[PDB]
A paper describes a structure:
CENP-E is essential for the alignment of chromosomes in metaphase. Our work reveals that CENP-E is recruited to unattached kinetochores through at least 2 pathways: a BubR1-dependent pathway involving the domain 2055-2358 and a pathway dependent on the outer corona and Dynein involving domain 2452-2598. We provide a structural model of the entire CENP-E kinetochore targeting domain combining X-ray crystallography and Alphafold2.
Next, we sought to determine the structure of this minimal corona-targeting domain. This domain contains a highly conserved region from Xenopus to humans that is predicted unstructured and flanked by two predicted α-helices. We therefore recombinantly expressed and purified CENP-E2452-2598. Using this approach, we found that CENP-E2452-2598 forms a dimer. We obtained protein crystals that diffracted anisotropically with resolution limits between 2.14 Å and 2.71 Å. Structural determination revealed a parallel dimeric coiled-coil in which only the first helical region of the construct was observed in electron density, likely because the construct underwent C-terminal degradation during crystallization. The resultant structural model corresponds to amino acids K2454 to S2506 of CENP-E. The structure reveals a tight left-handed coiled-coil in which the hydrophobic heptad interface involves aromatic stacking of F2478 residues. Surrounding interactions that stabilize the coiled-coil include salt bridges between the E2470 and K2471 side chains. The dimeric structure is consistent with the behaviour of CENP-E2452-2598 in solution, and is supported by previous data indicating this region mediates dimerization of the kinetochore-targeting domain of CENP-E2055-260819. The structure we determined is part of the coiled-coil on the N-terminal side of the loop and the conserved patch (highlighted in yellow). Overall, the CENP-E conserved patch and flanking helical coiled-coils are essential for outer corona targeting.
Residue numbers in the entry:
A (entry chain A): 2454 to 2508
B (entry chain B): 2454 to 2507
Write the structure that this text describes.
């Protein structure tokens, strides 16, 4: 019965580490994808200023 | 012992999901970070061209 208790605490720990990692993953995918969109706009601004400087 | 068996299985199942999630994260993050780094290089090179043009 002591083992059941230890196993259940280990189950609680491993699930919490699973949740923590999944939330960090989600956070970093979102921030990195937002950077991709931010730099897509920077690139658009660079093309527009370059067109006008050339014309 | 039956409950012990269920717990040990559940421990194995969760550690397996942890590894699976980790691998899928690392796959996607590396692809996206690659796009980010190519974008940064495009940006540097376009900025040079713009400074030249002006």
């Amino acid at each position: 019965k002591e083992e059941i208790e230890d196993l259940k605490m280990k189950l609680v720990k491993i699930d919490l580490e699973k949740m923590k990692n999944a939330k960090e993953f989600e956070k970093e995918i979102s921030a990195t994808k937002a950077t991709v969109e931010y730099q897509k706009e920077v690139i658009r601004l660079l093309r527009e200023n370059l067109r006008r400087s050339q014309q």
